[PDB]
Symmetry: C3
Amino acid sequence: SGIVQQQNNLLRAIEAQQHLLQLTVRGIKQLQARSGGRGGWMEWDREINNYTSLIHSLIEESQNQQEK
Amino acid sequence: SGIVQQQNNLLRAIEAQQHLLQLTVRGIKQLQARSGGRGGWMEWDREINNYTSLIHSLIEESQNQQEK
Amino acid sequence: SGIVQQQNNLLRAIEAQQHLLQLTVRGIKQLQARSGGRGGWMEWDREINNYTSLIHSLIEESQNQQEK
């Protein structure tokens, strides 16, 4: 412990930041929507999805073997 | 030290990311404002505030006992 | 290793979050643009650039001596 009780907090902070990140993307999405568009943002969405997937995978594997 | 000098950098990076996060939320807010709305975004604001509060608490407790 | 294989994952997660952060800023920028403005957001851009620079520096120095 000690140094380990820190890597848990750092991970909790990252997990929460991700919730803030997904909140701002939703906000941006509703903003593009109500002003036409949303058709040319297809590639933008793809990149967001891909990076969110990579992070979720990173967080899951970190939550995993942190207990051992 | 060594592994500890890393958890300080990782924390500094998280603290700065949070400043970038709060900058984008302000940008989104001024965007919703100048286009009517801002009345139906009450719940959105609540979630943002709550998550920002959780992070600030996480960062503060990490800054704390990192010295010991 | 062990505790170290975690600080690599935590760093990878931060690096990816930064890519998500830069994606949302681009989205916000294209939103301000197509609606006039972008002239009064000069100071906003400055702060974003400065914080992105600080993070890139933090990430680079963390990637560096993590091998030793």
